[PDB]
Structure 1
Amino acid sequence: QISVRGLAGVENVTELKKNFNRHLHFTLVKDRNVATPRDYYFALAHTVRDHLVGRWIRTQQHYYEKDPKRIYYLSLEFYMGRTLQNTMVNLALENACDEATYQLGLDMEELEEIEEDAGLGNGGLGRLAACFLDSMATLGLAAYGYGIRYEFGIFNQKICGGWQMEEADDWLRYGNPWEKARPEFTLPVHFYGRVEHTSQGAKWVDTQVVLAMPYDTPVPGYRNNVVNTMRLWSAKAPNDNVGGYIQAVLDRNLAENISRVLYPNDNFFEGKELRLKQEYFVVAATLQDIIRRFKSSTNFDAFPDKVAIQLNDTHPSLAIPELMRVLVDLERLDWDKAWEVTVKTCAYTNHTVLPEALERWPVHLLETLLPRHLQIIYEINQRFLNRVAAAFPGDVDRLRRMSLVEEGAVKRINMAHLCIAGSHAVNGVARIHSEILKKTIFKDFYELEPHKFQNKTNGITPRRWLVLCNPGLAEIIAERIGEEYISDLDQLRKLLSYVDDEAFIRDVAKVKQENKLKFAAYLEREYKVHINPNSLFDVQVKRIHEYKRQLLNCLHVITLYNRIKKEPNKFVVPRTVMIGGKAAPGYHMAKMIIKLITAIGDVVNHDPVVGDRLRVIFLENYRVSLAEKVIPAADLSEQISTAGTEASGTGNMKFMLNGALTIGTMDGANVEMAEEAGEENFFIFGMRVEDVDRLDQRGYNAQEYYDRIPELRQIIEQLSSGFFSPKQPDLFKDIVNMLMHHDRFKVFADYEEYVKCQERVSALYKNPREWTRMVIRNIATSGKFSSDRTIAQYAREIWGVEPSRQRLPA
């Protein structure tokens, strides 16, 4: 049908059909008479998987022969989504599979909807790991993703009576055709025990053993025949009265609970023992793999020349003392040499400045679980503080501020301080964020070691986030400038010479309309909700947090409703306001915000005077596969976090690539997005970082805003009095109290400018031609935000390896 989806050659189509029928028969053990759509999905999945295998085997044998420097990306989260379409796109098989399935009387799009998301992440940090894997394979790097194979990923979100309900994400129920179990490569991981000192040094003894069993998933590069590996570890118990015998077998569950479930708290660090076991589990098994592969190339001097370890946040920070443990205790290297190797091997990426989200492990947990690692950490700390003392003599408060050990009621280890000390590079994820790190929370460390601190602005993969989810747009771009932009997104700048092209303007607006019609039909078929496709699609999708200010969006929505009720016969630009995202199970305020959104919808969606001029919809179960649908349909992207709080954002970049305009604060990557497109082509409002700081010095008083803004007062009175909850009048008292007395994120302070800026958005939407010309200006300058650019920067500036677009032989 469309050119970017590849060739549908006579021979390839014939061969795909027969392999499909073979898998249906031999693999699934079904006949065409009883086969269901799920059976057909699996036969297709297995057929496509076959095409990966040859390339997967030859890629890995190529690395064994050439022995390049290996990149190990360690993360507790890989938010992968679906694999089938991504694999087809990267193998240039999409049109051929489309034709093959059509000739067998099937709709491939229907089959695609059957695949479960691999929801092994919470949000931006987890999705970043996934985009990074895609770009690393596309750039020909010898890269491995290492993590945990959770049996249960992020919970499925149901909305009952306006409230979030959580249910288990049993994503492995029907099996995973993409993974290959490697039980032969199982490795032991040690817990608890005690430290024994001998003539020869320290020994970690009397431990409990848990086995780590690897599962390998292929990661295909974009049309370069490169297939890398994501290796995820699964926890297994070792094999060593009737009631007693039975109970001993049932108690094996205790060991295997390690890999059972992803922790869904992305707002607040919790010092839970099971989470600590998960973190050590991934780290210990991974490092054994790394060392084995290194030894099969004695001389650890060359270790940093052959190995790079990237820590995705502090979650795998135990890699630092674990590498020291192995090098000192097992390989018998002297402390100083082991330390030199460790520092040159590891690099650390920070994703937030919010103190409640930073890992600080109680010393007593580490003492019990990992007694040797605690000894190593104390020793790291002493040697590090000796360096600080020598550089800043007499500065006693610097010593207590920079310590890896935090004093107080409970002693804690600061994992961020450990990461900076043990890494040769530390990066933030957007320019403004990396600057904030140097000026505020890591200032002392930057003064000691300025060379360590870098920026690496985040990116997204244009394969999943354009070609896959928005083929219509990918195709009209390809018509003008060809197909090379898919792996070189900077080429999109060539679209600027089409900003006054009447044909192109019409086509861009046509693609958006088609996307909006398709998504409008999705909402009716799967959720039974009616929307006007001619309205402006106003979309905020992301995890529910106070800092992301879904509440500010809520206040605007209520303002629009109140204005309509006041002047019903006045014209307003029609809007569909869509808000979606999951709240962490323990986050009471985030759960209240979801209830508020649905409550507003209940009032607004059923007011006859409003009509089809305003609709408020909460998008249920937001996840990667839902993002692929809603983002191409969006007109307006809401990126409205308090300045200084969102490290980067990546959702912002997805919307920019797909033809939405952005309303946002000067926060995270928004700053660089506005810089690339031009401030005149963005809807920027609100306090800058400097304004927030000024307000903090003075003291933020929300009452001031309530007193001086009549429209804001009305909303607060409506919330308090029970306008949005007639049967439970005080339902939203917690929200009002927080806004009025304890708002860390200054919602009221940005309200006026936000509302005014929203009026400017509506004004431009009234002029379709100029809206679309601004859109073209955005798409055309979104090239910087490809993860290929991001990964090339990591490779050159951190890992010390050169990227390559050279094809491997088929």
Structure 2
Amino acid sequence: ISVRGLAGVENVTELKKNFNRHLHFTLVKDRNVATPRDYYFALAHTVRDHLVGRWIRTQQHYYEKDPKRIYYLSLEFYMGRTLQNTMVNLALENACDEATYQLGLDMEELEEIEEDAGLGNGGLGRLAACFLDSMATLGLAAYGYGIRYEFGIFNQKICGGWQMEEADDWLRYGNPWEKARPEFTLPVHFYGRVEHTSQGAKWVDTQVVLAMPYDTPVPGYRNNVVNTMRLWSAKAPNDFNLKDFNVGGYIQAVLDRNLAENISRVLYPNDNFFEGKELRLKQEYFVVAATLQDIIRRFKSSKFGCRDPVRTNFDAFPDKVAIQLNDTHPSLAIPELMRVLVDLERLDWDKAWEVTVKTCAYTNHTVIPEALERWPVHLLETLLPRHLQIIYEINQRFLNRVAAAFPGDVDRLRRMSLVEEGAVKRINMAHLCIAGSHAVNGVARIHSEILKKTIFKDFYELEPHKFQNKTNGITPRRWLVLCNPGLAEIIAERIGEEYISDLDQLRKLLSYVDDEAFIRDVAKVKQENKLKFAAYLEREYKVHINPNSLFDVQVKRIHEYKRQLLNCLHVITLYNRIKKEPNKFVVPRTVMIGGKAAPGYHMAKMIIKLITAIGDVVNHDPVVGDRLRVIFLENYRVSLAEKVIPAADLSEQISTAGTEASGTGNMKFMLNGALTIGTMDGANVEMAEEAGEENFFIFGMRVEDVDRLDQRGYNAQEYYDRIPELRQIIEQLSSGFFSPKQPDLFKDIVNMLMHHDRFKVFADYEEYVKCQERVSALYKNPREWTRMVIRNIATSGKFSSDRTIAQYAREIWGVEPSRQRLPAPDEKIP
């Protein structure tokens, strides 16, 4: 059937009876009233059973051996569905497929019932999920820590061409994967005041919120290692949240508990954009305060909570603990760790600071200013008074370091300060992170260099040893084996299976680049994928596409810097050319654009309306026929990504040079047989470098060109004046060609494009359509297109998250990865 494992005799029988046990005893249903949703749950519980045994021994193992522990703090974890992934990592897929078949059910149909765990916005959250899978596969004693939002990223609905947001109640029917651990609830403080008494400061008169943990298992790939993802939930105490007496109402006091519990209610739907709301700051401190207590508790036991030197010496803390900060969201971990060490454990400042810097490491993910976290001091002042005092003291000492290294450089001092003066004073969280961590890294080579050269230049000059780079990666398990079993099978047929946890081995495929059978197969699976997606489209969304055309797709969050607008201009150009010479042959294309816009991002929402507006015109023009279709992919998410990517021919990674820190969707497309048209931005550079620029469609300005233009001054009128095809489009938009009933509907887009385009869309227009012509040329030659594809796939190995994690491990965390199978799952009950 494929290498989804063995469908053993004993195990298919065992699976079936357990499927029936759960349907009866767990779901309390009988075959006669059971629905697909019930069947899905019986299977999920049956699969979950197989990894609890491993989960328990893994955790027990780490307790016995006591290795260095990795803590990955992130406010986002974009997990997606987890049934199939679990089957894959446990080699259960074929057995489950068989068993459910014998039970008379379609596993694929059941898999579609599982709700996505959308606890993230985009790249940053998905990176975290890929990292977890890799850390488990490389046998690292690693823990993912976050917030268990009951409402994840909103579900997007397109009404009359506009985006409609609706609550994502992913827990509505339950989550069979998590395991509530109410017994490990912890208290978290807010507000209050600071009392300076005799021997130390005291954080007093605080409001308490309880943090209840929920553990989700993270299975490694076929090595019997099951790590833990601990997500916190906010709960109100039953005392003060009722006990602070003297009139108000007993009922009202019970109803008001949903005020402290609102902390983990909803994820903030902003991607690369900072909103300074108090609720967000609360979520940030919440995950940090609870997580650290758990970290120190585990440390206090270790082998110190037995003997060792005997005396809670936190000198070994950094040798046993490593906490990674995913962006600046969990930045309060630094001042929080100091508060606990200084205020509670009573270490001296300096010893405490040495410990903190040595255990903390920060990852930066963007250079755009509007994404930078600068919290107003009046907020920190009220909500976390002691942390503010600690931050001012960290700043004081740091700045003294600076003054001593750069005597007289008074502007450097203000530029480096953690405190920003002006309208309102703010705290620059990124500066905090750099000062309190022993390593700061970028997510792609160019981005990392940009940090050193630009944004964090002064910091780099002060401590050059802190700055590193760790190019992002993706997991070949979910992003290849899981979503594209067909491609994975034909690869395995030639080079075996060891590449799933050693993607570098994909290079061996280079020697099949002239192989006639392989070229035929690679081209076959991509055609099978396109057919399946074309079907799904009419199945769930309804209104036909042509599977023979080139599948041109751009799926990612809607942003001005990602330039879906630049993609829009090209689509309109194709349309206009066709209308000019109808009877001329052009390569057919189905251009699919999908992505979510943050609720408050007016421009982003205006862009989604434009895309659908273009499709209304293009898709109903009889002269165009089936040569051009413009489709907006609704509710783009992980599970949807797993469907489109394997069906794509062309991947659009056209951000303005120097704005996309890395990107990861780009890597997903590369490993799945799509060719890339893009700019020399983020990881695009390393991908072209790995595959050879001849096998990549690169165009537009490089970072240096962008800066030159800025010195000069960017003027969009010039481009408007010198390109008639461009001029024709802008005037079509301006006159209502795309919005008849509302002729001025797109005035904001045009106005912006002409007068305040921060991302110079026009500057790359000519080179973009010229370059698009070259891919259409190559697509006309099936054999050569597929051969270039094989050059990409065969060369994508460097982009596996296993490689990324192995580097973080050795260069930042100080631990050694290991592909050693944990001693089986075998029963045991001590």
TM bucket, shorter chain? over 0.9
Distance apart, 1:339 and its partner CA: 0.1
Q: Does the aligned pair in 2 maintain the 1:350–1:428 contact within 8 Å?
A: yes
Q: Indicate the SS of the match to 1:254.
A: coil
In structure 2, what is the Cα distance between the partners aligned to 1:432 and 1:84? 37
How high is the TM-score relative to the length of structure 2? Answer: 0.97
Farther off after superposition, 2-11 or 203-212: 2-11
In structure 2, what is the Cα distance between the partners aligned to 1:693 and 1:725? 36
In structure 2, what is the Cα distance between the partners aligned to 1:52 and 1:97? 14
Superposed CA offset, 1:728-755 (max 9, x none): 0000000000000000000000000000
Q: Indicate the SS of the match to 1:72.
A: strand
Q: Does the aligned pair in 2 maintain the 1:267–1:584 contact within 8 Å?
A: no
Q: Does the aligned pair in 1 maintain the 2:376–2:425 contact within 8 Å?
A: yes
Q: How does 1:187-336 map to 2 (within 5 A)?
A: 187-240=186-239, 244-297=249-302, 298-336=312-350
In structure 2, what is the Cα distance between the partners aligned to 1:781 and 1:762? 23
Q: Indicate the SS of the match to 2:621.
A: coil
- The reply to whether residue 737 of structure 1 matches residue 751 of structure 2 is yes
Q: Indicate the SS of the match to 1:438.
A: helix
Q: Does the aligned pair in 2 maintain the 1:212–1:235 contact within 8 Å?
A: yes
Q: Indicate the SS of the match to 2:554.
A: strand
Q: Does the aligned pair in 2 maintain the 1:720–1:729 contact within 8 Å?
A: yes
Superposed CA offset, 1:162-216 (max 9, x none): 0000000000000000000000000000000000001111000000000000000
Q: Does the aligned pair in 2 maintain the 1:69–1:801 contact within 8 Å?
A: yes
Distance apart, 1:542 and its partner CA: 0.0
Distance apart, 1:3 and its partner CA: 3.3
- The reply to whether residue 768 of structure 1 matches residue 782 of structure 2 is yes
Distance apart, 1:389 and its partner CA: 0.1
In structure 1, what is the Cα distance between the partners aligned to 2:521 and 2:280? 50
Q: Indicate the SS of the match to 2:172.
A: coil
Q: Indicate the SS of the match to 1:81.
A: coil
* Partner in structure 2 of residue 82 of structure 1: 81
Q: How does 1:94-109 map to 2 (within 5 A)?
A: 94-109=93-108
In structure 2, what is the Cα distance between the partners aligned to 1:243 and 1:137? 51
In structure 2, what is the Cα distance between the partners aligned to 1:267 and 1:636? 25
Distance apart, 1:299 and its partner CA: 1.0
Superposed CA offset, 1:619-674 (max 9, x none): 00000000000000000000000000000000000000000000000000000000
In structure 1, what is the Cα distance between the partners aligned to 2:757 and 2:179? 49
How many residues end up aligned between the 2 structures? 809
In structure 2, what is the Cα distance between the partners aligned to 1:208 and 1:527? 48
In structure 1, what is the Cα distance between the partners aligned to 2:528 and 2:194? 66
In structure 2, what is the Cα distance between the partners aligned to 1:409 and 1:536? 52
* Partner in structure 2 of residue 402 of structure 1: 416
Unaligned runs of 5+ in 1: none
In structure 2, what is the Cα distance between the partners aligned to 1:72 and 1:299? 20
Q: Indicate the SS of the match to 1:242.
A: coil
Distance apart, 1:242 and its partner CA: 9.6
Distance apart, 1:809 and its partner CA: 1.4
Q: Does the aligned pair in 1 maintain the 2:133–2:475 contact within 8 Å?
A: yes
In structure 2, what is the Cα distance between the partners aligned to 1:528 and 1:333? 65
In structure 1, what is the Cα distance between the partners aligned to 2:568 and 2:804? 34
Q: Indicate the SS of the match to 2:221.
A: coil
Q: Does the aligned pair in 1 maintain the 2:272–2:366 contact within 8 Å?
A: no
Distance apart, 1:266 and its partner CA: 1.4
Q: Indicate the SS of the match to 1:32.
A: coil
In structure 1, what is the Cα distance between the partners aligned to 2:273 and 2:503? 36
In structure 2, what is the Cα distance between the partners aligned to 1:574 and 1:29? 53
In structure 1, what is the Cα distance between the partners aligned to 2:370 and 2:730? 28
In structure 2, what is the Cα distance between the partners aligned to 1:661 and 1:741? 34
Superposed CA offset, 1:221-246 (max 9, x none): 00000000000000000011997000
In structure 2, what is the Cα distance between the partners aligned to 1:168 and 1:612? 36
Q: Does the aligned pair in 1 maintain the 2:120–2:153 contact within 8 Å?
A: yes
In structure 2, what is the Cα distance between the partners aligned to 1:693 and 1:186? 52
Q: Does the aligned pair in 1 maintain the 2:651–2:676 contact within 8 Å?
A: yes
How high is the TM-score relative to the length of structure 1? Answer: 1.00
Superposed CA offset, 1:232-269 (max 9, x none): 00000001199700000000000000000000011421
Superposed CA offset, 1:540-589 (max 9, x none): 00000000000000000000000000000000000000000000000000
In structure 2, what is the Cα distance between the partners aligned to 1:4 and 1:720? 55
Q: Indicate the SS of the match to 2:390.
A: helix
Superposed CA offset, 1:130-151 (max 9, x none): 0000000000000000000000
In structure 1, what is the Cα distance between the partners aligned to 2:518 and 2:802? 27
Q: Does the aligned pair in 1 maintain the 2:62–2:141 contact within 8 Å?
A: yes
Q: Indicate the SS of the match to 1:752.
A: helix
Q: Does the aligned pair in 2 maintain the 1:186–1:214 contact within 8 Å?
A: yes
In structure 2, what is the Cα distance between the partners aligned to 1:51 and 1:804? 23
Superposed CA offset, 1:279-316 (max 9, x none): 00000000000000000011100000000000000000
Distance apart, 1:409 and its partner CA: 1.0
Q: Indicate the SS of the match to 1:788.
A: helix
Q: Indicate the SS of the match to 1:252.
A: coil
Q: Does the aligned pair in 2 maintain the 1:536–1:574 contact within 8 Å?
A: yes
Q: Of residues 509, 515, 530 in structure 2, which corresponds to 1:516?
A: 530
In structure 2, what is the Cα distance between the partners aligned to 1:26 and 1:806? 37
Q: How does 1:124-135 map to 2 (within 5 A)?
A: 124-135=123-134
Q: Indicate the SS of the match to 1:440.
A: helix
Shift in CA distance, 565/17, structure 1 to aligned 2, threshold 3 Å: same
Q: How does 1:681-692 map to 2 (within 5 A)?
A: 681-692=695-706
Superposed CA offset, 1:447-487 (max 9, x none): 00000000000000000000000000000000000000000
In structure 1, what is the Cα distance between the partners aligned to 2:314 and 2:174? 41
Q: Does the aligned pair in 2 maintain the 1:577–1:616 contact within 8 Å?
A: yes
In structure 2, what is the Cα distance between the partners aligned to 1:781 and 1:497? 12
Unaligned runs of 5+ in 2: 240-245, 303-311, 825-830
In structure 2, what is the Cα distance between the partners aligned to 1:201 and 1:325? 11
Superposed CA offset, 1:6-30 (max 9, x none): 0000000000000000000000000
Distance apart, 1:703 and its partner CA: 0.1
In structure 2, what is the Cα distance between the partners aligned to 1:211 and 1:725? 52
Q: Does the aligned pair in 1 maintain the 2:588–2:627 contact within 8 Å?
A: yes
Distance apart, 1:529 and its partner CA: 1.8
Q: Indicate the SS of the match to 1:734.
A: helix
- The reply to whether residue 558 of structure 1 matches residue 553 of structure 2 is no
In structure 1, what is the Cα distance between the partners aligned to 2:4 and 2:272? 40
Q: Does the aligned pair in 2 maintain the 1:304–1:345 contact within 8 Å?
A: yes
Distance apart, 1:4 and its partner CA: 2.0
In structure 2, what is the Cα distance between the partners aligned to 1:522 and 1:440? 46
In structure 1, what is the Cα distance between the partners aligned to 2:742 and 2:476? 47
Q: Does the aligned pair in 1 maintain the 2:614–2:630 contact within 8 Å?
A: yes
Superposed CA offset, 1:689-721 (max 9, x none): 000000000000000000000000000000000
In structure 1, what is the Cα distance between the partners aligned to 2:641 and 2:424? 42
In structure 1, what is the Cα distance between the partners aligned to 2:170 and 2:807? 35
Q: Indicate the SS of the match to 2:231.
A: strand
In structure 2, what is the Cα distance between the partners aligned to 1:577 and 1:292? 53
In structure 2, what is the Cα distance between the partners aligned to 1:726 and 1:60? 63
In structure 1, what is the Cα distance between the partners aligned to 2:46 and 2:313? 44
In structure 1, what is the Cα distance between the partners aligned to 2:287 and 2:542? 43
In structure 2, what is the Cα distance between the partners aligned to 1:387 and 1:527? 60
Q: Of residues 760, 770, 773 in structure 2, which corresponds to 1:746?
A: 760
Distance apart, 1:367 and its partner CA: 0.3
In structure 1, what is the Cα distance between the partners aligned to 2:553 and 2:517? 28
In structure 2, what is the Cα distance between the partners aligned to 1:704 and 1:677? 36
Distance apart, 1:347 and its partner CA: 0.2
Q: Does the aligned pair in 1 maintain the 2:651–2:674 contact within 8 Å?
A: yes
In structure 1, what is the Cα distance between the partners aligned to 2:542 and 2:316? 61
Superposed CA offset, 1:45-91 (max 9, x none): 00000001000000000000000000000000000000000000000
In structure 2, what is the Cα distance between the partners aligned to 1:809 and 1:140? 12
- The reply to whether residue 675 of structure 1 matches residue 694 of structure 2 is no
Superposed CA offset, 1:338-384 (max 9, x none): 00000000000000000000000000000000000000000000000
Q: Does the aligned pair in 1 maintain the 2:557–2:597 contact within 8 Å?
A: yes
